[PDB]
Amino acid sequence: MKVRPSVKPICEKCKVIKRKGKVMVICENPKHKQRQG
Amino acid sequence: MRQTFMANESNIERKWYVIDAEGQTLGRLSSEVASILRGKNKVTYTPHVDTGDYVIVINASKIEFTGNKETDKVYYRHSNHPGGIKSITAGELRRTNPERLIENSIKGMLPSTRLGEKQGKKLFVYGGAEHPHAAQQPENYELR
Amino acid sequence: TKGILGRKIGMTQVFGENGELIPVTVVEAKENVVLQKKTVEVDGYNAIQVGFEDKKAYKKDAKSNKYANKPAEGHAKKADAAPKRFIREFRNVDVDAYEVGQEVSVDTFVAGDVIDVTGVSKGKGFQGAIKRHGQSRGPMSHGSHFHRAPGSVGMASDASRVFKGQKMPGRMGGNTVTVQNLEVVQVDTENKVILVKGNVPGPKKGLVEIRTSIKK
Amino acid sequence: SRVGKKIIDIPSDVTVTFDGNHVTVKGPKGELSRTLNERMTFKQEENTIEVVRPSDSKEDRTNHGTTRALLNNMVQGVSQGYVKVLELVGVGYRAQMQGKDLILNVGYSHPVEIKAEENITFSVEKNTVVKVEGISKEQVGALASNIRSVRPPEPYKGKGIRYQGEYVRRKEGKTG
RNA sequence: GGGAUAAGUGCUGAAAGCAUCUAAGCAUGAAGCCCCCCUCAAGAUGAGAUUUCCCAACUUCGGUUAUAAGAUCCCUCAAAG
RNA sequence: UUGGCACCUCGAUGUCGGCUCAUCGCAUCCUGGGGCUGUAGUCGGUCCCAAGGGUUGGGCUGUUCGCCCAUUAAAGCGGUACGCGAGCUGGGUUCAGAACGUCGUGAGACAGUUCGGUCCCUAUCCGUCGUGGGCGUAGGAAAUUUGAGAGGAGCUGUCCUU
Ligand SMILES: [Mg+2]
Ligand SMILES: [Mg+2]
Ligand SMILES: [Mg+2]
Ligand SMILES: [Mg+2]
Ligand SMILES: [Mg+2]
Ligand SMILES: [Mg+2]
Ligand SMILES: [Mg+2]
Ligand SMILES: [Mg+2]
Ligand SMILES: [Mg+2]
Ligand SMILES: [Mg+2]
Ligand SMILES: [Zn+2]
């Protein structure tokens, strides 16, 4: 999980979602998992 | 010419009311009850004497909050021991001690004076629909 | 779950089955009687009240606690028993297994039972921080004028006070203490004594309460 | 909400009955009851049901979609049921039935027991293919998730418990 | 050991025909939180509860009285100080 | 932290280090729970949650630091008048003596050095630790008690088996 203020797609398969009030990126590639913070 | 009536213990008549917390918002019920307890609805209101009425609150366990207060309104207290902060959420308190929840909300709206304490002592809160004060013959009171 | 009251007699030792030396406390637990039976219906909780160690009967001009007063005599005669020196409740037992008036013999416990023992620890009187709280001394030499003092009691302007819980000189001992997970080494029904493994709080002749250990 | 607008087909053998918000569906395999959103109306046709939302607000659209989906899931669960299939990978990784419960031996020093739940049936094939069958799609998914979480697939050899169709990313464990 | 959680892990699931741990709903998840364990504790003035004991005369008939049960003074003491 | 400012205190707010006693924050050193890994395993890296508890003896130096020896699960970082001198010490440092180098014609001087060199106070109030008396608790008493609250505790190694 990448926790950082700048959450955004890294590849075309990254998907920006919002869970529990937090912007996140979910992807088939586990390296690209992000959570805003 | 001085002519203002002053209530005193010889001419004060305190009634008993019952108020149903079910489906009511905590703070709004609380402000109204505080008015009743202080006697602010009486035309003989006299600041230096207790002209208020007794209130029984039933169904305290059915009081409701708006927003996310159930998990986000936190009651803190301190035991006067170093590091002695203890907290409880409003929802948890409603589950485990609704009487205290209502009591504390109402008593936070009464002055921190000797008379204020006395007036707050006229409040009776019960989580269920029954109260043990049929002897006092209380009347139902409709909010607002 | 079981319970009984006795007097601390003293310590001694027994040789175990492999010759291991077992220090033991001898507890004399004669004259235990169920005086009262408390229930959720009447009292709000279940418990048996046990009276231990008969005292003498009421007499007109009694001057000591050796003779029961009239309230105590009435309470005991309700159970049909002689008045008792010590009375304690056991909530850990099953009330339905007891009758008021019933004897509680040392035989309720068996060798191997793991038990909690509760007593009042020996009194020490007014004691200082080293003894009472196990604090460190200051230097005994090198110019020191600090040997047995308790040390700094706060900080400075913040907080301009001493916090509750500061450890200071004062009365030591005489406190309720429970030692958990002791063991019943032996029961001697002829002498009404229980040999408990290890040591228990309190002076000799002191009241001790033995219960089935809460942890298991 | 297209899902909300979409109508639910009821097989002739399946009966849906509403009690205010609460609904219950009976069918050949079992009965499923739950409480739906109180603000959704239901047009109960003889052979089909339709969900209707009061407004076009965000909340109403979300709840309309989810309500339709949940009710259709109940109907299809009573009619055909739901099944989830997991498989075991790894030499010595086996499963078996201890009556109704399922005991798994997956590389641990102890077997792991999973106790069956109401309305759910476990079935082991070839000692390496577990399948959970039920009427509740949600229950089936939950229990399959628990089984699989007993030991999920590791990337270096695929060993562990996986859903039979699951794709497991693979890694080259050892390099010079 | 129990309950509720954190970061997480998911199930079911639409908004957004797909997807999605989340919006509704259902799980799981820390030496941490609330308990469980130990001690103090009803001046908890909201002063709680149970068992037992005592229970009359005189009165301006409001009330009083010494006595009761009980507890002390004083004295012999220690396991207490 | 080094500073800037000069707003409280010069009819005095004791100054370094140590000792005694702690207390709080979390930006976490260990232990507990996780995600990612250029994570095969054993180890690691990085990030997230987490402050319950734990977080060592010595050599040198006044020292704080720092280096070193030997340990440990780990040897955390900070605040509290760089916590704490009406609780202790007094080795450093800025009184009087003396001396070296240096500067100065000199008297003398030097965030240069060296040897020596007085640390007072019977606790009034709050505060804190113990321990009694009064009255209250709608009769007067003896015991047994519920538990609203509060405090305590909370750490971890190694080995065997699998
Ligand atoms: Mg970036
Ligand atoms: Mg020492
Ligand atoms: Mg001395
Ligand atoms: Mg002055
Ligand atoms: Mg943190
Ligand atoms: Mg200072
Ligand atoms: Mg300081
Ligand atoms: Mg000082
Ligand atoms: Mg000196
Ligand atoms: Mg010269
Ligand atoms: Zn991606």
Concatenating the DSSP letter of every residue in D84-148 gives EEEEEESTT-EEEEETTEEEEESSSSS-EEE---TTEEEEEETTTEEEEEES-HHHHHHHHHHHH
CA gyration radius for chain B?
17
Distance, first Cα to last Cα, chain D: 55
For C39, residues 6+ apart whose C-beta sits below 8 A from its C-beta are C46, C95
Cα B76 off chain centre by: 20
* Residues sharing a CB contact under 8 Å with residue C17, sequence separation 6 or more, in sequence order: none
Token output for C209: 């309460």
Interchain CB contacts (distance < 8 Å): B and C? 7
Cross-strand partners of D114: D102
Q: Are strands B139-140 and B16-20 parallel, antiparallel or unpaired?
A: parallel
Q: What dihedral do alpha carbons C117, C120, C125, C131 form, nearest 10°?
A: 20
CA B121 to chain centre: 9
Domains identified in chain D, total number? 2
Task: Collect residues with CB below 5 Å from ion ligand 11.
Answer: A 10-11, 13-14, 27, 29, 32
**Whether residues D91 and D167 fall in one domain:** yes
Q: Which nucleotide is nearest to D35 (CA to C1')?
A: E25
**Domain end marker among D81, D112, D132:** D81
Asked whether residue C72's C-beta has any atom of DNA/RNA strand F within 7 A, the reply is yes
Cα separation, C59 vs A21, whole angstroms = 80
The total number of structural domains in chain B stands at: 1
Quickly give D64 CA vs E33 C1' distance in Å: 38
Instruction: Tell me whether residue D3 is exposed, middle or buried, using C-beta atoms within 10 angstroms of its C-beta: 0 to 12, 13 to 18, 19 or more.
Output: middle
The whole domain housing B79 covers 1-144
The H or E element spanning position C177 is strand C176-188
CA–CA separation, B113 vs B121, rounded Å? 12
Cα separation, C105 vs C122, in Å, equals: 27
Please give the DSSP secondary-structure letter assigned to residue D29.
Answer: S
What are the structure tokens assigned to C73, written together? 């005599």
Q: Which residues of B touch C165 (CB under 8 A)?
A: 81-82
From D39, D51, D38, D47, select the one nearest D4 (Cα to Cα). Answer: D51
Co-location of D161 and D103 in the same domain: yes
CA distance D132 to D111: 19
Which tokens is A7 given? Answer: 């959450």
- CATH (domain of D70): 3.90.930.12
D137-150 helix and D58-79 helix, angle to the nearest 10 degrees = 80
Cα(C131)–Cα(C50) distance, integer angstroms: 36
- State which of D81, D106, D128 marks the end of a domain: D81
| CB contact at 8 A, D82 and D133 | yes
How many CB atoms lie under 10 A from the CB of residue C130?
15
Q: Which of C213, C150, C137 is nearest to C180 (CA)?
A: C213
CA distances from C107 to C103, C137, C184 (A): 11, 49, 11
Q: What residues of chain B lie within 8 A of the CB of C163, using their CB?
A: 81-82
**What amino acid occupies position D158?**
G
Tokens 């097989």 correspond to what residue? D11
- Whether cis (ω within 30° of 0) applies to the bond prior to C159 is yes
D90 φ, ψ (degrees, to nearest 5): 125, 125
Residue with tokens 């039972």, as numbered in its chain: C113
Phi-psi map region of A30: left, alpha, beta (phi>0 left; psi -120 to 50 alpha)? alpha
Q: How far away, in angstroms, is C158 Cα from ligand 4 center?
A: 22
D150 within domain boundaries: yes
Instruction: Kindly state whether residue D7 falls inside one of the protein's structural domains.
Output: no
Do D167 and D135 fall into the same domain?
yes
Domain extent at residue C118: 1-215
- Chain E positions with any atom < 7 A from a protein CB: 7-27, 34, 37-40, 46, 49-54, 69-72, 79-81
Number of domain units in chain C: 1
**3-state helix/strand/coil string of chain B:** CCCCCCCCCCCCCCCEEEEECCCCEHHHHHHHHHHHHHCCCCCCCCCCCCCCCEEEEECHHHCECCCCHHHHCEEEEECCCCCCEEEEEHHHHHHHCHHHHHHHHHHCCCCCCHHHHHHHCCEEECCCCCCCCCCCCCEECCCC
Q: Are D27 and D72 part of one and the same domain? A: yes
Q: Are residues D74 and D86 in the same domain?
A: no
The DSSP element (H or E) to which C86 belongs, if any, is: strand C84-90
Q: Of D115, D148, D118, nearest to D136 (Cα)?
A: D118
D77 in the same domain as D114: no
Which domain range does residue D65 map to? 17-81
Cα separation, D4 vs D23, in Å, equals 17
- Residue D149: inside a domain, yes or no? yes
Parallel, antiparallel, or unpaired: how do β-strands C125-127 and C32-38 relate?
unpaired
Residues of C engaging B, defined by a Cβ cutoff of 8 Å: 163-165
Cα–Cα distance between C193 and B51 in angstroms, integer? 68
A24 close to A35: Cβ distance less than 8 angstroms: yes
Residue written as token pair 């230096």: B48
Q: How far is the CA of C163 from the centre of ligand 2 (A)?
A: 25
- Resolution in units of Å: 2.5
* Strands, sheet with D48-52, edge to edge from the N-terminal-most edge strand: D8-9, D48-52, D41-44
Distance of CA D18 from the midpoint of ligand 9 (Å): 94
Tell me if D4 is assigned to some domain. Answer: no
D46 and D120 housed in the same domain: no
Distance from CA of B53 to the nearest CA of C (A): 34
Which strand F nucleotides have any atom less than 7 A from protein CB atoms? 19-25, 34-41, 47-49, 52, 80-81, 83-85, 87-90, 126-131, 141-152, 162
The residues of C between 154 and 183 with beta carbon within 7 Å of nucleic strand F are: 154-159, 161-171, 174
CA distances from C48 to B14, B109, C40, C45 (A): 47, 47, 12, 10
State how far Cα C4 lies from the chain centre: 11
Q: Which of D81, D110, D133 is the last residue of a domain?
A: D81
Short-list D112, D148, D149, CA closest to D129: D148
The residue type found at D12 is S
| Cα separation, D159 vs C99, whole angstroms | 64
Listed in sequence order, the residues at least 6 apart from D176 whose beta carbon sits closer than 8 Å to its beta carbon are: none
Is D99:D85 a contact under the CB 8 Å cutoff?
no
